[PDB]
Amino acid sequence: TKDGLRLEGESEFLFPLYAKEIHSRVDSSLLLQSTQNVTVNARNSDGEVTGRLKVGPQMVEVQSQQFQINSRE
């Protein structure tokens, strides 16, 4: 399209992806699922993965040096 490009099909990337901001559509809720597990990772400057938010087959794991909870303020 003029301002973007709309795709209605299963865009299977047979190689890795890269981006900066991953959004979801305004009228549809993003879902992300698998059969074994889904992993979020973050790395230090040396590339060492240091904080993991893993959703395993049974129950969630969080691995980090700290685990805060706050309010919006």
């Binding site: 990772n41 060492e48 993965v49």
Partner: protein, 45 residues
């Protein structure tokens, strides 16, 4: 009571890192290019 008399002497009773390595995630390295000079050549011919 002499029966519960207890004697004790000296004896010899003698009984953190974090790292994970992924494989790769490099970004767009060497981010510079232009499409005018070649366009100028192929529209100047």
């Amino acid at each position: 009571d002499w029966c519960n008399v207890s004697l004790v002497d000296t004896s010899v009773p003698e009984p953190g890192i974090l790292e994970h390595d992924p494989f790769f995630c490099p970004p767009t390295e060497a981010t510079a290019r232009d499409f005018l000079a070649d366009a100028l050549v192929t529209l100047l011919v």
